[PDB]
């Protein structure tokens, strides 16, 4: 717990908001753990985290799950029960289950923020990071319409230095040709570190995906035990149960 007192001292004297977030030990330790207890880097991440929140009320003010319960019910998102071989939490997102006539890109971004605020409370996740699998099957121009240059920049920011989770891997599967232009909007804002941790698997993804996530994937992606629907429903239930933690850190 080195740097804790120092980190809290800098924050209080920079006039960081006492906000809806008390500078508890557990809160500040998210930032220290994300940056391997490098005080200067944890402080930069902390400042960026508040800056990111202040810039995007739309995504960050209401972490109440009621707005995006529809998206969860549609099967957009679940979190695997087991960790990967190095202890990362593994998140799955399915574009085909995002109706862009119904949910905005900000609503969809809010889903990741909500999940991220919940899983960051796990010390094992703070230490070993996360991997996210994005199944891009069914991506439409109507999805891309909603990814503006501002949205692309905000995506880059949470992947790099604006949220206290280590992104240890991003796996894009079933990526169509028309997606390449969307990614090229995000690319210029990414560090070389993160760029090297993005995997573009294509439409023949199974072998490589199984290599990275042995024995823990849903049936849909070559695993053997549970379905995506099971995992979606379980994460949905957990998020609904979390309504009051999420309310405590809203607005």
Tell me the binding residues for (+)-alpha-tocopherol. Answer: 163
71: which residues sit within 8 A by CB, 6+ positions away? Answer: 77, 97, 98, 103, 107, 108, 111
Residue 145's φ and ψ, nearest 5 degrees, are -50, -35
Report if residue 170 touches ligand VIV, rule: CB under 6 A.
yes
86: which residues sit within 8 A by CB, 6+ positions away? Answer: 128, 168
Which DSSP state fits 250? -
Which DSSP state fits 83? -
The piece of 43-51, 102-110, 214-222, 243-251 that touches ligand VIV (CB under 6 A) is: 102-110
Report if residue 113 touches ligand VIV, rule: CB under 6 A.
yes
Measured at CB, which residue is nearest to ligand VIV?
Answer: 112
Q: Phi-psi bin for 53: left (phi > 0), alpha (psi -120 to 50), beta? A: alpha
Residues making up the annotated binding site are: 161, 163, 166-168, 184-187, 193, 197
Report if residue 52 touches ligand VIV, rule: CB under 6 A.
no
Percentages helix, strand, coil for the chain (3-state, rounded to 5) are 55, 10, 35
CB of 111 vs ligand VIV, minimal distance in Å: 8
CB 225 within 8 A of CB 219: yes
Q: Which is nearer to ligand VIV, 11 or 94 (CB)?
A: 94
Report if residue 128 touches ligand VIV, rule: CB under 6 A.
no
Residue in 108, 228, 231, 239 binding ligand VIV, rule: CB under 6 A: 108
The piece of 4-12, 50-58, 109-117, 212-220 that touches ligand VIV (CB under 6 A) is: 109-117
Report if residue 190 touches ligand VIV, rule: CB under 6 A.
no
Q: Which is nearer to ligand VIV, 6 or 199 (CB)?
A: 199
Give the closest residue to 92 by CA, choosing from 227, 197, 202, 196.
227
Q: Which residues sit at the interface with ligand VIV, rule CB under 6 A?
A: 105, 108-109, 112-113, 116, 130, 132, 134, 147, 155, 158-159, 163, 165, 167, 170, 182
């Amino acid at each position: 717990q080195p740097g804790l007192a120092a980190l809290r001292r800098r924050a209080r004297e920079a006039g960081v908001p006492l906000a809806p977030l008390p500078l508890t030990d557990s809160f500040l330790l998210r930032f220290l753990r994300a940056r391997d207890f490098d005080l200067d880097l944890a402080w930069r991440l902390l400042k960026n985290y508040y800056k990111w929140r202040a810039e995007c009320p739309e995504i960050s003010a209401d972490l109440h799950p009621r707005s995006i319960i529809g998206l969860l019910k549609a099967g957009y998102h679940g979190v695997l029960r087991s960790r990967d071989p190095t202890g990362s939490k593994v998140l799955i997102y399915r574009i085909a289950h995002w109706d862009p006539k119904v949910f905005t890109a900000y609503d969809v971004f809010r889903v990741s923020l909500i999940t991220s605020e919940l899983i960051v409370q796990e010390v094992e996740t703070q230490r070993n990071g996360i991997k996210a699998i994005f199944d891009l099957e069914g991506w439409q121009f109507s999805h891309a319409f909603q990814i503006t240059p501002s949205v692309a920049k905000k995506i880059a920011a949470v992947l790099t230095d604006s949220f206290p989770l280590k992104v240890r891997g991003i796996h894009l599967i079933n990526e169509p040709v028309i997606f390449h232009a969307v990614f090229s909007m995000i690319k210029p804002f990414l560090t070389e570190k993160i760029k090297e941790r993005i995997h573009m698997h294509g439409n023949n993804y199974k072998q490589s995906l199984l290599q990275h996530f042995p024995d823990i994937l849903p049936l849909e992606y070559g695993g053997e035990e549970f379905s995506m629907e099971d995992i979606c429903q379980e994460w949905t239930n957990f998020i609904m149960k979390s309504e009051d933690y999420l309310s405590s850190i809203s607005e």
